[PDB]
Design a protein around this ligand. Sequence first.
Ligand SMILES: [Cl-]
Ligand SMILES: [Mg+2]
Ligand SMILES: [Mg+2]
Length: 242
Amino acid sequence: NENQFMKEIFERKGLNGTFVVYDLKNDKIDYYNLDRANERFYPASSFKIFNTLIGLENGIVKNVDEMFYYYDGSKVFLDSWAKDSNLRYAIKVSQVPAYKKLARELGKERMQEGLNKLNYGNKEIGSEIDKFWLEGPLKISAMEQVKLLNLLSQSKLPFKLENQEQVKDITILEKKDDFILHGKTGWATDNIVVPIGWFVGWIETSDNIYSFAINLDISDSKFLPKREEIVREYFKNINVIK
Ligand SMILES: [Cl-]
Ligand SMILES: [Mg+2]
Ligand SMILES: [Mg+2]
């Protein structure tokens, strides 16, 4: 059964996409568009969550607070990227050049081993070590993202506990008394006719964890706010955001 509230919001907004929420305490899923929930898409910058985990596991940086990317005056799409950074800052601003540097330093072999340890989507790297998550060939489904995030949120992935902790800490979006929202946005625009907007993450409350993924057809940057709007509207409906 599709979640009826999710169905209504998608229909109201007139958007094509999918949304999955896993409720840990109740071991159950709530979804809109099951077939698309299982369809694999380029993860775009939602892959930064896991790129960071694999980088930490390999010791590419000591931790997410160690300076790592050194800016050189080169062209950057967002002005927030035109500065030296650590990974913590880099994920928060989605600083692609810092994560391309990470990918390259990891190299194909170590990156592949990371994807394979995670069983991440189709696990395809192709022959573009700093593009594979943004233009193909890597693809992952909303359902697959949720499974991974459910594990990450409980430090249950096969990675060092302190590295999982770091990735949780850098992904904090809104901490309130009654919930803490972690997540990452992405937008797949390359090598695709209809771009795909992602927002993935989880919400921990005093006694539950809700892991989630939405993706939507988004052709104009003006509609990118809708990814997080729809997610917050659902979590307000169920009194998690409160
Ligand atoms: Cl920015
Ligand atoms: Mg270093
Ligand atoms: Mg815990």
